[PDB]
Design a protein around this ligand. Structure first.
Ligand SMILES: [Co+2]
Ligand SMILES: [Co+2]
Ligand SMILES: [Co+2]
Length: 512
């Protein structure tokens, strides 16, 4: 009532309506148009406006799945449908790609395809090979073939500017070091600069909706950011000295996948609890007397609002801030989960502190654990879970304790999410992943240790993806946010260019 819809909102809402009709008109086509509907899903998904079309996408992919044997007629559509159906939790098999594997590990495109068309087919093959489950060797071969092919294309040049952009973006970001709005922001340029694409009927409404949605939500997020800057000053964290301005980066990361304005608690608390978790980790592994690490743990165990009025100011303010943010976040989760969750949340942070303390003792005692023992403790100690649990509970998907146990600790899902952070970090100091491996394998070089931990991460990511897309009673929106937390950390390590991410997501609108 007191605030009107802005001009861009009205325009966006009109475009949403016209595009739903495009989905419905397409579903009125008498005949098998599985590919046409797939490609429309593709566009609205790459541009991260797919949350406005959940019913229409469900209908379109249900139909594509029904006709999967008729839709997978060539390399392009097989690869395109394989990725999109897999990512939307249809049980599709990487076997579809075997129909195109020739000899010498090569994959076959329709002979009549233009050079541009063939490259588009290999790009979708590359894009599909990144969502690989354990022991799908066809995926490893597709990745290898497509990487070689697209690089040779980039070497040989002689291709258009927008298609070269697309190859470069896909080759650089892949899937695990990536996020929806990051892909969307690139495809706004990749599609918008393709004249043939923008003239194809309907595409311009799709692209305009994508730009509009991006600019509309970015200004909601830039506003929310204000309340986070205020919190950084009121909580006196700006004067912790050993801290860092990472709260803005962490906020921008969460904005690149958690979009709707109603989820302001998720974006806020991820930024807060991840900045805090980072600070706590510095206190334990760097700026904290072994006495205070004890008083910290004790304070947490009791849930004191305050540390003893005698400790350093740095440690004292972090604790007070930590205590407050955990409470406020749990208050938010009460409203949406419909119960008390502060008890459970304290246990989550306790398991995190246990993990950090054990690494402190190890350093203090000169003890180098086996790699297996390091990784097991390295999961709680990586801090993934404490940045995931409480913010995810503030979404509007209910998670009763019996459902939570299939997403949170001790589930395989959470474990593979923690390992992704630990192994990625430890491949980017007495007790590390590298050192524990050398202790386990006497005479192993650093090169040999680092090479092993990288393969382990690759295997763990495949397990993660298979576990992520396996169906169960967990609301997908909860799994998706948890999964994208892990990706944001992979992306963060890739970028440590991170200032560009913050500019793109929060500060710089896209011209329409
Ligand atoms: Co406007
Ligand atoms: Co087949
Ligand atoms: Co640290």
């Amino acid at each position: 009532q007191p605030y009107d819809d802005s001009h861009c909102m009205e325009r966006a809402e009109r475009l949403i309506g016209e595009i739903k009709d495009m989905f419905n008109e397409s579903g009125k086509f008498c005949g098998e148009n599985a590919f046409e509907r797939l490609v429309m899903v593709d566009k609205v998904q790459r541009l991260a406006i797919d949350r406005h079309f959940q019913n229409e996408i469900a209908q379109a992919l249900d139909y594509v799945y029904r006709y999967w044997s008729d839709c997978s007629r060539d390399l392009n559509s097989a690869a395109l449908g394989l990725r999109i159906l897999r990512l939307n939790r249809y049980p599709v098999s990487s076997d579809v790609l075997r129909h195109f594997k020739g000899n010498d590990g090569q994959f076959l495109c329709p002979s009549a395809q233009s050079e541009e068309e063939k490259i588009g087919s290999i790009l979708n093959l590359y894009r599909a090979s990144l969502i690989a489950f354990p022991e799908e060797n066809i995926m490893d071969e597709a990745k290898a073939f497509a990487t070689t092919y697209l690089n040779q294309v980039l070497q040989n040049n002689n291709i258009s500017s927008h298609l070269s952009k697309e190859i470069k973006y896909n080759l650089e970001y892949g899937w695990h070091t990536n996020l929806p709005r990051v892909e969307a922001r690139n495809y706004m340029d990749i599609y918008g600069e393709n004249r043939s694409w923008t003239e194809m009927g309907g595409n311009m409404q799709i692209l305009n909706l994508a730009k509009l949605d991006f600019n509309i939500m970015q200004s909601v997020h830039r506003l929310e950011l204000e309340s986070i800057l205020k919190w950084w000053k009121d909580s006196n964290l700006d004067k912790v000295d050993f801290a860092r301005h990472r709260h803005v980066e962490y906020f921008a990361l969460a904005c690149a996948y958690c979009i709707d304005a109603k989820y302001y608690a998720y974006r806020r608390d991820f930024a807060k609890l991840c900045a805090l978790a980072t600070i706590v980790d510095d206190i334990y592994d760097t700026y904290g007397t072994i006495e205070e690490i004890k008083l910290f743990n004790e304070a947490v165990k009791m849930w004191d609002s305050s540390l003893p009025n005698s400790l350093p100011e740095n440690i004292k303010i972090a604790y007070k801030a930590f205590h407050m943010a955990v409470n406020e976040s749990a208050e938010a989760a009460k409203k949406t989960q419909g119960r008390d969750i502060l008890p459970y949340a304290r246990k989550v942070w306790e398991h995190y502190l246990i993990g950090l303390t054990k690494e402190a003792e190890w350093l203090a005692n000169g003890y180098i654990p086996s790699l297996e023992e390091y990784l097991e403790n390295g999961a709680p100690s990586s801090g993934y879970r404490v940045t995931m649990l409480q913010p995810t509970l503030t979404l509007d998907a209910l998670l009763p304790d019996n459902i939570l146990l299939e997403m949170d600790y001790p589930s395989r899902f959470n474990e593979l999410l923690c390992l992704s952070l630990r192994l990625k970090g430890d491949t980017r100091e007495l007790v590390s992943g590298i050192s524990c491996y050398i202790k386990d394998h006497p005479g192993s070089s650093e090169e040999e240790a680092l090479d092993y931990l990288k393969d382990l991460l690759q295997k763990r990511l495949k397990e993660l993806d298979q576990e992520y897309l396996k169906p169960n009673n967990v609301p997908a929106i909860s799994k998706d946010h948890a999964y994208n937390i892990a990706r944001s950390y992979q992306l963060l390590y890739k970028e440590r260019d991170i200032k560009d991410l913050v500019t793109q997501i929060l500060l710089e609108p896209i011209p329409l």
